[PDB]
Design an enzyme around this catalytic site. Sequence first.
Site, PDB file in Angstrom:
ATOM      1  N   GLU A   1       0.775  -1.235   0.000  1.00 36.74           N
ATOM      2  CA  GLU A   1       0.000   0.000   0.000  1.00 36.74           C
ATOM      3  C   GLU A   1       0.813   1.295   0.000  1.00 36.74           C
ATOM      4  OE1 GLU A   1      -2.709  -0.545   3.312  1.00 36.74           O
ATOM      5  OE2 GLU A   1      -3.477  -2.415   2.464  1.00 36.74           O
TER       6      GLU A   1
ATOM      7  N   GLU B   1      -5.545 -10.983  -1.616  1.00 38.54           N
ATOM      8  CA  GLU B   1      -6.386 -10.985  -0.415  1.00 38.54           C
ATOM      9  C   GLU B   1      -7.859 -10.960  -0.758  1.00 38.54           C
ATOM     10  OE1 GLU B   1      -5.153  -7.715   1.981  1.00 38.54           O
ATOM     11  OE2 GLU B   1      -3.019  -8.035   1.581  1.00 38.54           O
TER      12      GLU B   1
HETATM   13  O1  LIG Z   1      -5.092  -6.510   4.088  1.00 36.37           O
HETATM   14  C1  LIG Z   1      -5.805  -5.474   4.663  1.00 36.37           C
HETATM   15  C2  LIG Z   1      -6.286  -5.591   6.098  1.00 36.37           C
HETATM   16  O2  LIG Z   1      -5.417  -6.510   6.794  1.00 36.37           O
HETATM   17  C3  LIG Z   1      -5.748  -6.749   8.205  1.00 36.37           C
HETATM   18  O3  LIG Z   1      -6.973  -7.428   8.286  1.00 36.37           O
HETATM   19  C4  LIG Z   1      -5.816  -5.406   8.941  1.00 36.37           C
HETATM   20  O4  LIG Z   1      -6.199  -5.636  10.333  1.00 36.37           O
HETATM   21  C5  LIG Z   1      -6.771  -4.436   8.264  1.00 36.37           C
HETATM   22  O5  LIG Z   1      -6.796  -3.202   8.958  1.00 36.37           O
HETATM   23  C6  LIG Z   1      -6.312  -4.218   6.770  1.00 36.37           C
HETATM   24  O6  LIG Z   1      -5.011  -3.528   6.782  1.00 36.37           O
END
Ligand SMILES: OC[C@H]1O[C@H](O)[C@H](O)[C@@H](O)[C@H]1O
EC number: 3.2.1.8
Length: 375
Positions: free
Chosen positions: A155, A261
């Site tokens: 990101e 994801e």
């Molecule tokens: O991949 C994204 C997702 O990953 C985890 O679940 C984090 O706790 C979220 O806040 C977000 O950053």
Amino acid sequence: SYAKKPHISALNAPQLDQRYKNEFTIGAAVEPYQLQNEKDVQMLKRHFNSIVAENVMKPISIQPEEGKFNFEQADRIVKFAKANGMDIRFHTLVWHSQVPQWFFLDKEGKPMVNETDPVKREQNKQLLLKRLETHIKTIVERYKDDIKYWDVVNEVVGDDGKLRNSPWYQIAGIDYIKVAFQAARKYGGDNIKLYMNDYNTEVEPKRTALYNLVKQLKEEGVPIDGIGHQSHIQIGWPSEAEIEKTINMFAALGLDNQITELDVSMYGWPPRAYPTYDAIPKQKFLDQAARYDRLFKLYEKLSDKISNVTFWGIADNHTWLDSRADVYYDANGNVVVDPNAPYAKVEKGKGKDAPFVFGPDYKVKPAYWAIIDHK
Ligand SMILES: OC[C@H]1O[C@H](O)[C@H](O)[C@@H](O)[C@H]1O
Ligand SMILES: OC[C@H]1O[C@H](O)[C@H](O)[C@@H](O)[C@H]1O
């Protein structure tokens, strides 16, 4: 067709990964506790041939204190993967979210972001980049023989189309991204694959910004093998057309593509969720199944450009989307799901979402039948 199919146990159902053999691996994000879970373990051995740590491999989990690495949980994931012949993805080496703050303190212990002297800023940059390399080197040397795919940076491009202005960028500028990739390659060897991971990779101006960034880095000789598309998508957004355009765009630069994801939310944005899993009607699972059908049909069509598709979870009983599942209530205390209806209050993250092709009780969902067949 797949809508009339029985909701049989997923534990023994036709293997998901086998269905896509020779096209791309099928993976799942996991938490250590799930490895001590009878059913989650069965699910992993049954349908998946790729695994990624949902949280225990992120920066704060590995080196929360300078010089003190905690690989205990990470080792458990890798050990399980190796014992079951699964590929492994490393959930990011660099990320602005929950970053250990000690990284950004200068030699004197002061916040590097406050430094105004260009010469001292240069000194701080060198310290930060040195820490970054040490962090990457230690991790990469430990797992280079077991983990083939790596989300080197995560990101780094903001949703406004500009580089995310995190401390990494404020202090080192674009060089923190170059150093991360170069350090990974240097200590990891030529056999591991390096990726830049992000969400909304299909949305402008982020998509083009991401494109330009990787195009320039590769032009400068920075070793980057592919793009990771988080794919935290919805039932009808982003459109298959934009997803396809996104994949082709990056493949054209000679980059590999991995859906990293994946989760197909039942809601829009901002999401108005159902309060419980049981409140979700069959209608929702049918629209979701249709989306999954289109989605994996598009992925197969682009299988030559996609090497892996990983779900950010195993079954609907566990998904980070529940933290985003806000339940809206009208003045009479009744749930509001209609995205355009008026409401009185909101109970943040109290609802339930159902992402996957596997339900909370480990039974296949209509979405499963939709991507398991050849129609
Ligand atoms: O991949 C994204 C997702 O990953 C985890 O679940 C984090 O706790 C979220 O806040 C977000 O950053
Ligand atoms: O980061 C979370 C959110 O980012 C963007 O606003 C997306 O449009 C939204 O769907 C969600 O993914």
